[PDB]
Structure formats: C-alpha cells, structure tokens
Design a protein around this ligand. Structure first.
Ligand code: NA
Ligand code: NA
Ligand SMILES: [Zn+2]
Ligand SMILES: [Zn+2]
Lengths: 169, 160
C-alpha cells in the first residue's frame, strides 16, 4: 500500500499517571489504507526511527477535531487570524502544534496536535475516507479531551464511554 | 541583539584534506546584526543545542549563491513539512578570511531571504570583495578556476 500522508505531529501520552504527568511528544505519523502508525523521528539522520505505535484502520470508529485547551502553553497556542503567508514557516511547522484532533478506537482516544489548520483538515478528511466502510463507526463522540480521570465534556469516567454528542447534523 | 532570521540548514563541513569525503550536518542558524551562529538542533527538546560555530558579521566579505553540485545525492536534489527539513537543494556561500562557509537551504525563497538579510547586515563592512568564486571548493581546489587556495581572490566579478 502507498503512504497517503506523512507528518510530524505532537502526540499526547496515555500513561496512567497522576500529578498531571501529561506528556506531549513529537512523532512521525504515517497513514495507509491499512494502518495509522507513529514513530520517533530521527532528526539527525532525517528519517523515521523506532515504531512507537500502530492502529489498524479497521478498528477506528471515529476521527474528528477536539475542542482546544483553555489556556495552552505558547507552543500549542493558536496563531493570528492572519497569515497571507505564501510560505510554510520552517521552524514553527515543527515547533508549534496548536490544532488537535482525536482518533477513536478500542483502546480509548488518541490525541494528535497538528502545526496547522490545513494539515489537520487534510488528515481528518483522509482518515474519514479510509475508515468509511468500517463495521463499528459511531455517530456520537466526546467533543472535549479526557483529562484527570474524566471527559471534560460530560464528566464521564470511562474512556470507552459512548460519546456525549451526536455528529455533524 | 534581536534575531533577524532563524532556520535549519544543511552545513557542509570544512574539508580537512583533498581526499576527505564530504560531510553535511543539519544545523540551526541564527542571524543578528552582529553574528551569524550555528548550533546542533535538539529535536526532542525542540530547541538549539550545543553551539558549533559563529562568524562575526564584521568579518564577512561577500554572500552569494553557489552553482549546485552536478549530480547530488537525493538529500540535495531539486511547502510540505517533511521536505522542508529533509531536502536541502539550494546552496549559498558566506565568504570571509577563514571561509568559505557552504550552507544548503530547503527552498529558493528561504535562500533569497537569507542572502538579502546577510547583504543588509554586512553593508558597512570594510573588506567587502567585488569578486567571488561561483562554484564550490572541492577536493583541493575551486571547481570554477582551479585555484588551490581557499582564500584566493574570486575569479568572477560580482555584477549584481
Ligand atoms: Na523521508
Ligand atoms: Na524556538
Ligand atoms: Zn463527553
Ligand atoms: Zn573561482
């Protein structure tokens, strides 16, 4: 299969850590019609390093945006309403990741932060395409992050809880 | 001073001997009105690491493009987040007494911005040259004129 998309995103850890040990780490994400996988990125050698995870596309049930953090650190803060920039800013495209989206499957939700709105859209559209004929697609989801033992949107404590919001219209 | 430009470029190592195979290393480059410095880029830390070098701006005598290598490997063969940090096809040179310094940019636009700012910043220097070497110093001599001294006067008149 061909690699449909390849990007460096900031991935939130799943952990099982108290003391709000939420980790955000940059990973190289790859998408094919069969799997969404992620790896460490070997900057010096300019290639992907060891595999950190893999999700078979058929197990994905939902992919949508996530309501952003209320007061995120500067590296995840959403830029100016403007741009008109006919040029991708090299540094910010690998240092700032303000646009989160979620990939929902069996093992709870995976949260991914994109450096740009365009790129997040590109990934959500393509993921929606590759999961289109999946057996267990859900028509509800949690619009907000799961943090500190519960979803911010409905306060439920189970990660596999049915979504509290019906999709689109 | 304020940072005028910040970019990750592929830097060519100074060829120690005429038989030494060329080494290229990605470095974070910073330009201010006083210095042009480069550091390792700590990807995981998302910031500059150990300083690798610095060039006093007052010491720069010329900044121009360099004719590219004829058959470069994939990494330097002629905006997508990945290619902008993995592919570096556009070279430019910073000339000074202890130079030249060869830097490869991922894009033509970025190289154009750096050359423009560097020219701004060296504008009032006392030893600016009117001639330069259009090609790389390779395996012991400049490809452009065959002169074997890196500090040799440039073989081409700089007509802007
Ligand atoms: Na690559
Ligand atoms: Na920075
Ligand atoms: Zn909810
Ligand atoms: Zn020459």
């Amino acid at each position: 299969a061909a690699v449909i998309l390849e990007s460096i995103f900031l991935k939130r850890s799943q952990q099982k850590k108290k003391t709000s040990p939420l980790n955000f780490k940059k990973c190289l994400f790859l998408l094919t019609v069969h799997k969404l996988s992620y790896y460490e990125y070997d900057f010096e050698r300019g290639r992907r390093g060891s595999k950190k995870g893999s999700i078979d596309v058929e197990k994905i049930t939902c992919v949508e945006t996530v309501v952003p953090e209320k007061n995120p650190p500067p590296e995840r803060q959403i830029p100016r309403r403007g741009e008109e920039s006919s040029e991708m800013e090299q540094i910010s495209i690998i240092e700032r990741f303000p646009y989160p989206f979620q990939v929902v499957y069996d093992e709870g939700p995976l949260y991914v932060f994109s450096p740009t709105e365009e790129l997040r859209k590109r990934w959500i559209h393509q993921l929606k395409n590759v999961i289109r004929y999946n057996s267990d697609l859900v028509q509800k989801y949690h619009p907000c992050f799961w943090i500190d033992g519960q979803y911010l949107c409905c306060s439920q404590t189970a990660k596999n809880a049915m979504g509290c919001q019906i999709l689109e219209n």
